Design a protein around this nucleic acid. Structure first.
Lengths: 129, 213, 82, 82, 149, 186
RNA sequence: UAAAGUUGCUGCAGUUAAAAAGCUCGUAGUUGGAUCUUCUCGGCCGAAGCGUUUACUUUGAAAAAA
C-alpha cells in the first residue's frame, strides 16, 4: 500500500522536474509535506504552491521553477545527532557549497544548516539539491 | 501579431483560407497539434482554428525576417505539391530552395559539393521532410514547418497549423508567408493587395498542365 | 561564479533553456537560439529589435519546442491573447 | 504538455475525468423530484437508485434499478435538484 | 487492490465537498432518526437503511442531517445487531459455502474460496476484538457457525 | 440579553441588545427572538474607515439564528446605516496539551474545540447565506499563507459587497488573510 | 586487512551471465494514510525547578591508568 507519503510527494516532484513540467500535483498532502515544501521554497528551489482543500485530505499543486537537481527522502528516518550530521552531508549532498538535508527536530522541520545553527539534532526526512 | 490591429487578420485572408481548404485538417490528430484545432466535424475531420494559423504564420514570419542574410534561410520541399511553392517563395523573399530530393548530409557533411549551412529552415511537411528535420538536430538549426493535425512536431520549433495535403492549401500558405515576410521586411504593400496572386505558388499536375495548355 | 574575493573565475556562464531553465551544454548541437523580430506598433515593420529564445535539444526531441516557443512569445506579447 | 495549469482546469475536462481523479472529487449522481399525473406530492429519487421505489398513490413504479443510472418510467416527469 | 483478489478496481462513492443538508431535503433530524428506527424494526442492516433513505427519501447522507452515523444511531437507541453487519455477512457467506461444499466434495475451488472467506472472517474478528466490539473469547468455528446467523 | 463571559455588557453590546429587544417588542420575529439571546459584540474596522459588527452568539442557539439570519441582518443594517453585521457563534478553543501542563483537565480535548475545527466553523458561520464550495491555501515565497474561499455563484448577487467585510472580521478574530471568490462549476 | 560496490547498512545483484519459491492463504517478524495553536500561596513589592508517558534530540553528573 502507500506508506511514507513524503516519499511519494518527493518522487512526484523529482519526476515532474526531470520531465520539465511547470506544475506538479501531489496527493495526499500532510503537515510534513507542507513543511518540507516550505523549507524548499525558502531556499528558492520550488516557488509558490497551493493547497487544494478537499474534505478528506488536501492536494498540493506546486509550481516548478527549474532549479531542482534532485529531491529525495531518507527511509527510515534515522536519528541524526549534531556530530553525525557531517557524515550525512558527505553521503547525500553533491557539494559543500549547496544542497540541503532536511531534519525534523524539536524546533521544527528545517535544513541541516539551521539545525546546526540552533544546536539541535533530529530525524532525517530527506534532501534536495 | 501581438494584438496589433495592423497585423490583425482581415476578411480577404479568411476568404482565401476557406477557399483553399486550409482549415480542413486530417482525420487523425497529433496530441501536440491539439491546441491549434477548434472542433471535429461529423465526418471525422479536424477543423483548424484559423486565428491560431494566422498567429503561427506571423510568428514564423517574424522568425524569418529577423535573419539579416536572406540566403541563410533554407526552404525545403520534397513533395511535388510544395516544389513550385518553395521556388516562388525563394524568388519572392530571397531564401535558398531545395526542391525534390534532399541529400542526406547536406548540413552535416562539410566535404560534400552541395553543403550549405543555413540559419533557419522552413519545410512543407515534417513527415515528408523528415531528413532536413533530423539534420537540423546536428547544426543548431531552428525549423518552421507547415504542419497538419497528424504531423509530428519533433524538431519543429514553429509549426504553422494548416492543411498541407492539398496543393491549393500548400500554395496559399507559402504565398501568405512570403507576403508577410516581405511586408515586415518593409518592401511590398500592407494596406493594398500584393502584386503576386496566390495561384502562382499552386502546383499543377500534368493533367491540369495539359488541360490549361 | 564568485570566489571569496568576489571576482568571477568561471570560464563562462552557459545559456539556460527558456522553457526549462536548464543549462544548455556546450556540445548540445540540437539546441536552437531563435530570434523573433519585434515589430513596431502602428506600421508593422521590422524595427531592428528582436526577442531571443534559447531552446535545449531535449525539449525539441520530444516535440515540445513548438509549444514552449509559443508560450514564450505569448508571455512576451509577440502572440495575441487568444 | 509541459505547461498545464492544474490549479484552474477546464470545466469540460473536469466533467470528463473520473469522479475521483478530479481536483476535488464530486459524484456523477444527482437527486431528482418526480411528478406523476395523478399524485400531488413530490418524491425525491436518487439517479442511481438500487431499489424499485414505488409511488404510494399510483400503481406504476418510478424507476427500475440497473447497472448504472436508474431507469425512469414514462409518465413521470423528473426535475434534477440543485 | 483487493485483499484476496488480483483486481484493483477503482469504484466507490465520491462524497461531495459540501457537508450541509440538501436544500430539497425537508425532514428534520428527528424525522430521519425515526425513519431509521422503523427501518431497523423491519430488520434492515445499516447499509440497507442508508440505501433506502438515499433512494426513496431524498437524504444524501444521514450523517449530514442528524450529525451521526446510522450504526451509532442504532447503538444509541439500543437496537443494534449483536454482531457487526459485515462480519455477519462474511459469516453467512462462509456458512453457505460450507453447506455447498458438504455435498460437492470434489469442488476444490469452493474449498479455496472457503479458505479465503474464513481468512477474511478471522481478520475482521481480530480487528473487532481489538476494538472491544466483540467479546475476547468470540471464536468462529466450523461447528458453531450457522447458529450465529 | 447580552451575557458576556464577565457578564458585564459594554455600550455597543448594550445598544445591540436594546435593538434586538425593540425587534422583539414590534416585529414579525417576536416568536423566535423571545427564546433567543446573544452573548457579545464588538466593532472593528474591516477596511480603511469602514466598520462592521460581529454578533457573537451561543452555539446551541446559533442554528436558531441561521433560519432568521437574513431578516435580522436586514433590520440591523437598517438600524446602523452602512455598517455590515455578521453573526458568529462564540466558540472556545481548548489549548493543545503540551509536555508541560497542569492537572486541570483529566479529559481528552474534543475535536471541535481545537483551533483548526473552531476556525473552520467560524469561516462557515461567518456567512450564513453563502456556503463554501471549496477553498485553497496559497503559500507565497515568503512562507505566508493566503486562504481563498470559493462561494456559490448562484448566490453571488447578494454577497459581493459583504466580501472584504468577511476578510476584515476573519483577520480580526482568526488572524489569517482570506480572499473570497466565486467560481462557475459548483 | 584494504583493494572487495567479488557479502553490498552506507552499497551489489536475481529476463537471457549464478539467481523470483509452481500458486495462494496465513501467524510471529517488518512496515503502516489525513487529521488536534508555585496550590500549608510564595523570602527591599515576597521561590514553581515534569503538579499524563516513552523513543528521539540537547545538556549535566558519574565514568582507571596505559
Amino acid at each position: 500500500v502507500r506508506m511514507n507519503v513524503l516519499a511519494d510527494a518527493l518522487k512526484s516532484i523529482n519526476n515532474a522536474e526531470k520531465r520539465g513540467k511547470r506544475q506538479v500535483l501531489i496527493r495526499p498532502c500532510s503537515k510534513v509535506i507542507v513543511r518540507f515544501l516550505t523549507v524548499m521554497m525558502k531556499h528558492g528551489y520550488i516557488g509558490e504552491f497551493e493547497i487544494i482543500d478537499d474534505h478528506r485530505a488536501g492536494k498540493i499543486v506546486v509550481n516548478l521553477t527549474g532549479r531542482l537537481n534532485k529531491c529525495g527522502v531518507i527511509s527510515p528516518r534515522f536519528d541524526v545527532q549534531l556530530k553525525d550530521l557531517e557524515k550525512w552531508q558527505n553521503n547525500l549532498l553533491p557539494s559543500r557549497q549547496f544542497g540541503f538535508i532536511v531534519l525534523t527536530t524539536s524546533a521544527g522541520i528545517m535544513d541541516h544548516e539551521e539545525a546546526r545553527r540552533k544546536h539541535t539534532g533530529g530525524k532525517i526526512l530527506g534532501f534536495f539539491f | 501579431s501581438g494584438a496589433l490591429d495592423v497585423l490583425q487578420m482581415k476578411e480577404e485572408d479568411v476568404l482565401k483560407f476557406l477557399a483553399a481548404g486550409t482549415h480542413l485538417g486530417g482525420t487523425n490528430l497529433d496530441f501536440q497539434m491539439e491546441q491549434y484545432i477548434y472542433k471535429r466535424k461529423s465526418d471525422g475531420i479536424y477543423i483548424i482554428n484559423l486565428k491560431r494559423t494566422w498567429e503561427k504564420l506571423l510568428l514564423a514570419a517574424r522568425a524569418i525576417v529577423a535573419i539579416e542574410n536572406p540566403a541563410d534561410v533554407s526552404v525545403i520541399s520534397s513533395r511535388n505539391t510544395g516544389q513550385r511553392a518553395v521556388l516562388k517563395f525563394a524568388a519572392a523573399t530571397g531564401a535558398t530552395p531545395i526542391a525534390g530530393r534532399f541529400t542526406p548530409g547536406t548540413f552535416t557533411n562539410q566535404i560534400q559539393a552541395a553543403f550549405r549551412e543555413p540559419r533557419l529552415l522552413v519545410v512543407t511537411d515534417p513527415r515528408a521532410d523528415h531528413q532536413p528535420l533530423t539534420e537540423a538536430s546536428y547544426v543548431n538549426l531552428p525549423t518552421i514547418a507547415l504542419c497538419n493535425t497528424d504531423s509530428p512536431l519533433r524538431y519543429v520549433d514553429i509549426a504553422i497549423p494548416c492543411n498541407n495535403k492539398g496543393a491549393h492549401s500548400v500554395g496559399l500558405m507559402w504565398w501568405m508567408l512570403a507576403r508577410e515576410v516581405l511586408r515586415m521586411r518593409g518592401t511590398i504593400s500592407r494596406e493594398h493587395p500584393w502584386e503576386v496572386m496566390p495561384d502562382l505558388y499552386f502546383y499543377r499536375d500534368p493533367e491540369e498542365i495539359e488541360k490549361e495548355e | 561564479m564568485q570566489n571569496d574575493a568576489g571576482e568571477f573565475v568561471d570560464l563562462y556562464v552557459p545559456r539556460k533553456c527558456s522553457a526549462s531553465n536548464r543549462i544548455i551544454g556546450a556540445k548540445d548541437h540540437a539546441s536552437i537560439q531563435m530570434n523573433v523580430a519585434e515589430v513596431d506598433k502602428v506600421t508593422g515593420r521590422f524595427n531592428g529589435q528582436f526577442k531571443t529564445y534559447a531552446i535545449c535539444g531535449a525539449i525539441r526531441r520530444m516535440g515540445e519546442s513548438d509549444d514552449s516557443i509559443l508560450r514564450l512569445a505569448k508571455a512576451d506579447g509577440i502572440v495575441s491573447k487568444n | 504538455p509541459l505547461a498545464k495549469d492544474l490549479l484552474h482546469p477546464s470545466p469540460e475536462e473536469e466533467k470528463r475525468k473520473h469522479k475521483k481523479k478530479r481536483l476535488v472529487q464530486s459524484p456523477n449522481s444527482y437527486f431528482m423530484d418526480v411528478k406523476c399525473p395523478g399524485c400531488y406530492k413530490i418524491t425525491t429519487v436518487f439517479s442511481h437508485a438500487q431499489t424499485v421505489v414505488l409511488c404510494v398513490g399510483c400503481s406504476t413504479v418510478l424507476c427500475q434499478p440497473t447497472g448504472g443510472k436508474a431507469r425512469l418510467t414514462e409518465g413521470c416527469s423528473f426535475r434534477r435538484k440543485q | 487492490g483487493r485483499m484476496h483478489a488480483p483486481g484493483k478496481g477503482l469504484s466507490q462513492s465520491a462524497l461531495p465537498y459540501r457537508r450541509s443538508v440538501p436544500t430539497w431535503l425537508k425532514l428534520t433530524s428527528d424525522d430521519v432518526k425515526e425513519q431509521i428506527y422503523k427501518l431497523a424494526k423491519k430488520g434492515l442492516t445499516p447499509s440497507q437503511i442508508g440505501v433506502i433513505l438515499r433512494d426513496s427519501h431524498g437524504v444524501a447522507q444521514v450523517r449530514f442531517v442528524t450529525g451521526n452515523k446510522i450504526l451509532r444511531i442504532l447503538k444509541s437507541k439500543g437496537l443494534a445487531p449483536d454482531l457487526p453487519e459485515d462480519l455477519y455477512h462474511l459469516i453467512k457467506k462462509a456458512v453457505a459455502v460450507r453447506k455447498h461444499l458438504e455435498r460437492n466434495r470434489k469442488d476444490k475451488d469452493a474449498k479455496f474460496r472457503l479458505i479465503l472467506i474464513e481468512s477474511r472472517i478471522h481478520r475482521l474478528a481480530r480487528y473487532y476484538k481489538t476494538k472491544r466490539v466483540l467479546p475476547p473469547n468470540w471464536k468462529y468455528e466450523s461447528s458453531t457457525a450457522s447458529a450465529l446467523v | 440579553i447580552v451575557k458576556p463571559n464577565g457578564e458585564k455588557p459594554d455600550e455597543f453590546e448594550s445598544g445591540i441588545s436594546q435593538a434586538l429587544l425593540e425587534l422583539e417588542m414590534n416585529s414579525d420575529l417576536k416568536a423566535q427572538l423571545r427564546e433567543l439571546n446573544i452573548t457579545a459584540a464588538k466593532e472593528i474596522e474591516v477596511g480603511g474607515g469602514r466598520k462592521a459588527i460581529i454578533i457573537f452568539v451561543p452555539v446551541p442557539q446559533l442554528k436558531s439564528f441561521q433560519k432568521i439570519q437574513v431578516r435580522l441582518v436586514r433590520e440591523l443594517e437598517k438600524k446602523f446605516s452602512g455598517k455590515h453585521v455578521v453573526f458568529i457563534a462564540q466558540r472556545r478553543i481548548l489549548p493543545k496539551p503540551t509536555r508541560k501542563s497542569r492537572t486541570k483537565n483529566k479529559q481528552k480535548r474534543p475535536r471541535s474545540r481545537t483551533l483548526t475545527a473552531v476556525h473552520d466553523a467560524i469561516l462557515e458561520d461567518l456567512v450564513f447565506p453563502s456556503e463554501i464550495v471549496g477553498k485553497r491555501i496559497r503559500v507565497k515565497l515568503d512562507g505566508s499563507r493566503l486562504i481563498k474561499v470559493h462561494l456559490d455563484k448562484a448566490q453571488q448577487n447578494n454577497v459581493e459587497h459583504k466580501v472584504e467585510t468577511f476578510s476584515g472580521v476573519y483577520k480580526k478574530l482568526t488572524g489569517k488573510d482570506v480572499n473570497f471568490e466565486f467560481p462557475e462549476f459548483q
